[PDB]
Ligand binder design. Structure first.
Ligand SMILES: NC(=O)c1ccc[n+]([C@@H]2O[C@H](COP(=O)([O-])OP(=O)(O)OC[C@H]3O[C@@H](n4cnc5c(N)ncnc54)[C@H](OP(=O)(O)O)[C@@H]3O)[C@@H](O)[C@H]2O)c1
Ligand SMILES: CCc1nc(N)nc(N)c1OCCCOc1ccccc1CCC(N)=O
Length: 168
């Protein structure tokens, strides 16, 4: 199907996770998956994106701010320099755009989850176990519903699938 009705406010979370729920370590995403970059890009294009400061830090710098999207960086550092983005000091202000995609990281997903009505999740079939210091994906309960895509191979051979969850 791929349809998801929307209301006067849409707050979406988008992430890619290992089976174990690892999304981040050492300030990076511990795999590369071209189809997921393409998916992340097309979903978020033209929208406001919200990210924690550490996620802004983890962006390759030549791709800061992410092109074609309104970049919003959540930080408690009032003097934080984020060239080409805006810095907001609270989650409330961050989610004021009528359509917002939260693009990371572990901290901000957790805080934003209660307001979210879509989760766009790439499951990467990689057996990375949770380690000390890892950033972790939220656990979705059964208020979330939607569609699970088929397993696909990237040309590299890495296997992945897409979940598109929503709720009222
Ligand atoms: N696989 C994926 O889909 C994916 C996507 C995005 C990121 N990641 C990874 O996840 C990791 C980063 O995640 P993380 O959980 O460490 O950090 P994060 O959520 O990106 O950023 C946390 C920072 O956000 C700010 N913050 C958090 N809550 C706030 C609030 N209520 N008000 C104001 N500011 C707030 C603070 O910034 P200040 O310290 O500046 O105050 C905090 O240190 C990296 O490894 C990144 O590569 C993975
Ligand atoms: C594509 C990764 C990703 N994937 C999903 N599915 N949700 C996310 N929030 C998500 O994270 C978006 C923030 C980090 O983006 C990276 C990180 C490493 C390499 C590439 C990118 C894409 C953007 C760019 N031009 O660099």
């Amino acid at each position: 199907s791929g349809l998801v009705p929307r209301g006067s406010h849409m707050v979406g979370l988008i992430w890619a996770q290992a089976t174990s729920g690892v999304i981040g370590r050492g300030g990076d995403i511990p795999w590369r998956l071209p189809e997921d970059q393409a998916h992340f890009r097309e979903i978020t294009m033209g929208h406001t994106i919200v990210m924690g400061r550490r996620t802004w830090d983890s962006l390759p710098a030549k791709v800061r701010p992410l092109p074609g999207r309104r970049n919003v960086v959540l930080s408690r550092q009032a003097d934080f320099m984020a060239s080409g983005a805006e810095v907001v000091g609270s989650l409330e202000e961050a989610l004021t755009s009528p359509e917002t995609w939260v693009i990371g990281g572990g901290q901000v997903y957790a805080l934003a989850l209660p307001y979210a009505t879509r989760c766009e999740v790439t499951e990467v079939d990689i057996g990375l176990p949770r380690e000390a210091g890892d950033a972790l994906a939220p656990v979705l309960d059964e208020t979330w519903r939607g569609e699970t895509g088929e397993w696909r191979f990237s040309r590299s051979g890495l296997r992945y699938r897409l979940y598109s969850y929503h709720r009222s």
